[PDB]
Amino acid sequence: HKVTKAHNGATLTVAVGELVEIQLPSNPTTGFAWYFEGGTKESPNESMFTVENKYFPPDSKLLGAGGTEHFHVTVKAAGTHAVNLTYMRPWTGPSHDSERFTVYLKAN
């Protein structure tokens, strides 16, 4: 399963096993970057399985062709994965100037 900027407002069911990923295209803003809550990222039902985070901002005023800040959670356990990724300035993030992503997926 894979998520992308459109999934910023998605509700879906997923199949797992390989990987259940959540990727953002960044959309380089003005300091904000996509994190879960900022600096920290968590995957649900993680212990034996877990999430990797990898974010690549090519640009900062437009888009470096393929802005790509992703969150890859590898888990297999019957649960619902609500992915709220917060697009803020990593060193602070303006309380109401930061965006956020949210896909509602069922990871099992």
Q: What domains sit in the chain, N to C, each tagged with a CATH number?
A: 1-108 (2.60.40.2020)
Strand, helix or coil at 37?
coil
| Cβ count near 78 (within 10 Å) | 9
Nearest to residue 108, comparing CAs of 89, 80, 88?
80
Beta-strand relationship, 20-24 and 68-74: antiparallel
- With vertex at residue 8, the alpha carbon angle to CA 73 and CA 47, rounded to the nearest 5 degrees, is 15
Experimental method: NMR
Here the tokens at position 24 are 């953002």
Instruction: Please tell me what DSSP assigns to residue 5.
Output: G
Q: Produce one character per residue of 45-77: b if its CB has 16 or more CB atoms within 10 Å, e if not.
A: beeebebebebebeeeeeeeeebbbbbbbbbee
Strand, helix or coil at 73?
strand
Strand, helix or coil at 7?
helix
The strand order across the sheet containing 33-35 reads 10-13, 99-107, 79-88, 33-35
